[model samples]
Target: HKSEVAHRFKDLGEENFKALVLIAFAQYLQQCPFEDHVKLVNEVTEFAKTCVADESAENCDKSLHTLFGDKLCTVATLRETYGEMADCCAKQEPERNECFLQHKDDNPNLPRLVRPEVDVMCTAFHDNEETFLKKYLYEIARRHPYFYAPELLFFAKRYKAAFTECCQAADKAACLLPKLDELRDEGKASSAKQRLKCASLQKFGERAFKAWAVARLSQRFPKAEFAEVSKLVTDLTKVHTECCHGDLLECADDRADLAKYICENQDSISSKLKECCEKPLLEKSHCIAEVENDEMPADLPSLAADFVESKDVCKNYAEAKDVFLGMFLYEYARRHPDYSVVLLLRLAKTYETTLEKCCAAADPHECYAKVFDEFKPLVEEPQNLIKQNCELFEQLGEYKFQNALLVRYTKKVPQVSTPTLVEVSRNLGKVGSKCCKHPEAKRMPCAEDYLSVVLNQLCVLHEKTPVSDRVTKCCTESLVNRRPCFSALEVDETYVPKEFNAETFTFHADICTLSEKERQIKKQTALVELVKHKPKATKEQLKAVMDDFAAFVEKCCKADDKETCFAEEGKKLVAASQAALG
Candidate 1:
């Protein structure tokens, strides 16, 4: 019974469930407190075999009376599944067992299976081969509960074989990790199932098959219009129906036609998949195949760009309102990432309100014609600030960018712990340094995510020490306004810059003796000190002053008369600072 489905119910053959329904049947009956279920199961197990082979539903109908007497629905299989074969069993089709083979929903909330660490899985494999193989099957059952049992078994057998192969190697982990990767990459398995689904349409009928396809498509993309999804289904059915058993060379011309079909209407479907649609015609299917389903995030109204651009707002909404609203959110989320989900929802709800009012008015089209512009400030300001901050981050480079954060954050919340302040500044610098390095298309979104993270850290870090109303208001304000509020914070202008002395900016020959990192630290300290002393100076003035000192520092460091160079350059540097301070 270890890894074999037919071990207990050999008469039922192996076509039906093992780790699936039959396991439920066995485990549940065994758990019965006092039903004398031995004869009860014995009768139905044998009758299930008879129903599969015989044309009559007589035996199938008879077996159920004893087994399902009063407690059929109450039985639990694999903890979550229930007994489900009674209806499918009493069928008259010669291949009525085929009824059991079709897919059904799993408990969507079933906890994802946790696999053993590589070392642990490997250790278990070597220590006791059969037990680990059984555990592998058990976990796989839960991981892919809705997958056909036969297909699940195929992978299970492969897992057992992989363990056997990898356990013998000199480097066990090296040999096993790739085997696990091969298991994880289910590309071929998925395509094979899809092809069979196409084949089943031909065998069964278009009506039945198309309903399943539409169900799958809508479930995966709840926001997609049935009309839009149907068009995609039409293209796929045409290709798969004609090509599943046909020569591969024939579909080249057809796929080009299909790609054109999808590309022209991609806006109505999904802009995310447009890159795939625009790819080389024959490559379109492969590209589309690579794009996986994305769950619509909760509490967010979701598509995208075209919802605003399309004409006849009420006409569009009248035709398919749910799909229209769905596409609107989907398009916005797809095109804009600078706005938080909260802000995106606000925009969604705003548009939704606009639609509600305008579509109800006597002149609906006229009412909404100029409405799109008003929402610009919602997204535009945040996006502008995001771009400006990241661009400044790139312009300032790492050292000075972080130093700027220290001045702003320390000024805003002067009582924050110095060590926490250090991390906060460096964290912003790290995010900016990393995110700003991305390509222009992705740069803002990357920076925005970490910016939100850093701002939340700022809020959480200062929660206990609310320096004043500014911190509390900005921290407590709704998400859309929170970042802007912090951005608009007034500096504590009454605070004076720390005074400096002649010795403060004094050049020293020992600066050359420092390591690269240490030199950067000293140079940064000099710039920060200068900025503090001349707090009123603009970037241009500070740049001019810093450029001169940096030149003298670099020039004097390599000179033999480091002492004289400092004396001459130091006097000049102090004078330049005095000029900058003006």
Candidate 2:
């Protein structure tokens, strides 16, 4: 089942202890998948083989901490959960792995994204660079074992760079602290990328993903067995789920952890990919994603011509959502490799929504009569904001387009609060900016995948908070055609608003003396509030109002008596908006 090591147990002069350590590690990990169990065996075997006699105990504890990290904190947690499934482990190895795997489950959660105290991190780094770096690697790796190696290394590199740049600064705190935010912003951008990839992965379906993953592995290592390659691909899914739609660190951490597993089991997985998995490869995920594909095995299931029209469709769907939906994904994906995952998700969502609505209709038979007919048009045609957005992202490019996007969405979905709106819009803009960076030839599919992801998120958000009925229809209720649904949406032109306070434009006494940065910040904040207040204003009207406010601020801030000038100019600006906007 595994290889012989250079007897590091001899270093500790304790072969029996090595065997015991290996077994104990396996015992606790009876729930691990086959590859995971083997990964543990290799690590434990290596740990014992390398340990010096007297140093074994302390280093043994250190080794365990390195392997498990804060997961030791999760010990009590599993102690309770494991008892719930101890019977399989009572006599469990390969058989045991699956038995325990059947009961044990993973919860995909990120630790949290919140503001960290700069002093706390800086003080640790200030103490000693490498000392903090070691802990930094340990903490980050353990906290998110699923992430990529390169990102972790980049983070490590960037971590040291933070100290290098700021360690000797006159006020280290001033220099060092903002670096955390810099890292955070960098992290958020990467996290958005991860989020889009994950969303695409999930929408694409695991079975389809499995086929593609296995195809790539087999294609990469043509000599590798179908069963062995498929096994590694199966293991890949464990990390893919946790990595996606979860913690930023955990995503990369979990993926790299798989890189370790794949590398450790190279014989079964891929001898070639092992080259990429080893030292100095860019990152495991990049190498892995860079791995290309082969044709599906001839036996893959396909969507039947009449599968959608089957009388049992509702009955099957009623039993398990995943079973019914997953079947569609499996069949559709394998059949239409050329179709965008966005379209795939849209069709699946449409099928599900139709099933949901039709299954409950008073005339179920009639509702079922023309169900597939409804989906036929949607499958062939591409329309609405989803298409419109890609066109704009390409024509206007990221900065101009993303800002316009933010402006348009804030106006359209004004029902959402500003903070929530900003957060969602920022995510959309980030995803858009990224996809649009690609060549036009490759843009639509990328746009469709990620833009749909953001829109799907918006649709999900609407489930908790009430928006207009049309919004609910496009965004939540209809779900799949939300792209088209939102496209057809008429802005609530009738949503006339009360007049805003003219004082919103009134400059503070020191406005003229403020730094350009500070003044722009104040001006942008005012424009945002103006948008919020005037929800009914068209895009042109809003721009006109912004121009007037900008002119007012420039000329008024210039006048010797800035206060009187702002006061007089602000009223006329408000009156001009009232006259023109109406």
Candidate 3:
């Protein structure tokens, strides 16, 4: 008899034996695992049946109230006992389950419970639930599937019903005390050592307990949401103690949810804390202040300089408009265009000022076309013009002819309209006269004057058609060029004036080609001199010398040296003629 009893007590350790006895005595009024364990399971199953029949605990109100008397009472006791279990397990991982199993019936014969309901409980309770649910539920499902299914289902239903009763009675703060009491009573009903095997069920059941806590707290703090109180309790209850017998709660990624909840309830919590004590580093502060009397501009000149010196385009554009308007100099000089009148006047003056600058910088003959291109958009559509004529004028003066042409062609209104023949003639005379003074201005017809050819063609097309109208034309073909730069034929100055062949003149203009006879003659003369110095020259060396001579000839033709336009053209002609021979 002594040996048999010793074997029964073999599972119990001296340290946990006392706590185990307390839990066992509270549950079935006995310490023996075989007797008390059976009683606890029967009581839990009976309670589950009661819950399933009633739906609400209206009939079992007295027992339910007794079960959940004070929110924190049972919770505090469980915290201590669970903390002990956790501490023992943490210190000695191998003996944790054995220690609980020893004092309990350790019955492997229990009905299985649905895991989904437990999962729902876990999510609902979150950090408030113990970590042991993972180990217990997994063991039941994997090692003992029969015990997990019905036991968890029974526990979940009864626990949720009791918890909901407490929540309905009071806010979260008041509810925790009662709910905790219920958990303590339940723990007592189930032998602590035996109950440790089903610790995961107890943990997930903690969700209903948290809901009760939230509901009770909301009664006292009417402004506060029950969920926030629930969260705080859930967060605060997370620190594991040795007695706790569940898996450790994981708070990772849950912080974002907590943060959102806290941010939303900031006012209510803040008011409460104000009445109590300040939480250190709790508030997020942001500063927004308007500066009054923040240093005025020194004077008009200084302000103007600042405006001009500004690198930011938005700021500079406004300031530039002001300067153009003479507002910077003539008016208050605040560099502020606060009124529509000031802005309108400023914009008008900008165009005027830009045109003046462009004209002043341009050649007399080139300025008209340049200004037309510059002001096309401004004159055509002034409303949308910002930096009026500024970009166009800058582009034109920089000799970006192609860009200027593109703008001119794309804009609907022509700035300088079609020039008549007399106007074209006048512009041509002026351009030719300024050729020696302004070489670039002499290269082509002023863009404005080039429009005259179109006008002339239009006029001829509209005129009366003769019998040979297809081959005939009204205006003199060589009228413009013949009139300007006239000279008399002389014995020394080339006597014969070739008969003006209109067709030949037209052909010369139509298919002008480069002659290379002169370029070849020049290369041969240079090579003959080099051969005089070196008689036994290799073919490759001679070829190299010819290449160098050719490069020199090409460079001379292209070089920007002082020469009349006719003389420059003559040089090109001679170079091309010489190149054809070699």
Q: How many residue pairs clash (N, CA or C atoms closer than 3 angstroms) in each of the candidate models, in the order given?
A: 9, 12, 60
In terms of lDDT, the best-performing candidate is: 1
Per-residue lDDT of 51-136 in model 3, one digit per residue for the tens?
Answer: 44454544333332223222112233343544443333332323543343333333344455433443344355455432233233
- What lDDT score belongs to each candidate, Candidate 1 first? 0.58, 0.57, 0.32
TM per prediction:
0.42, 0.55, 0.14
Q: What tens digits encode model 2's per-residue C-alpha lDDT throughout 349-459? A: 667777788889876656866655766776556534345666787776554464565566666665656556655655676677766566543455566656665776676
| Comparing 1 and 2 on TM-score, the stronger one | 2
Per-residue C-alpha lDDT of model 1 across residues 13-60, encoded as one tens digit per residue:
433323334323332232333223333444445655555555354534
Model 2 error, position 455 (Å): 4.7
Better of 1 and 2 by lDDT: 1
Report the alpha-carbon TM-score of model 3 versus the true structure. 0.14
User: Which of the two candidates, 2 or 3, achieves a greater TM-score against the reference?
Assistant: 2
